[PDB]
Design a binder for these strands. Sequence first.
RNA 1: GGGCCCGGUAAGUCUCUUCGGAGAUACUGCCGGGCCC
Length: 129
Amino acid sequence: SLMDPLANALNHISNCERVGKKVVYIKPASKLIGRVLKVMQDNGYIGEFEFIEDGRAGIFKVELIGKINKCGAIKPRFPVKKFGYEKFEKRYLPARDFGILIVSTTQGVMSHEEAKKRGLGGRLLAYVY
RNA sequence: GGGCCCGGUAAGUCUCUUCGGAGAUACUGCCGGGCCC
């Protein structure tokens, strides 16, 4: 069985970043994945990225910039309250002071830091440091 | 068998609460469609 779309996207990025590649093409291109990439971008973890129409689910061309040390999907997508992030930050960001949790809120996908800044709880979907 | 999208829902979930419920709707689920492999 194939790995879920988002997990898959984060795995490829992770590795092509490690190997030093300057680009990666992510196959399944869901709105969710795009939304997650937007967060990683706004946080300086990846460069430009674009949707490439292919008649299927689409494709994401992501510009890597050697800013990622590791990233992946969080499974299951744990629910988190407005003040329950710390517990998760210790669990997925091995490095204190570095990284973000990407959470899905009723107001959209964003970093846990913006979710807190807004008093929103949500679903954990990934980590990046 | 797998995946993408649209509309609906609001069980899970999040927020608030007079703690009865109310509001929200991204994710999961559910209903109805479109489509790709």
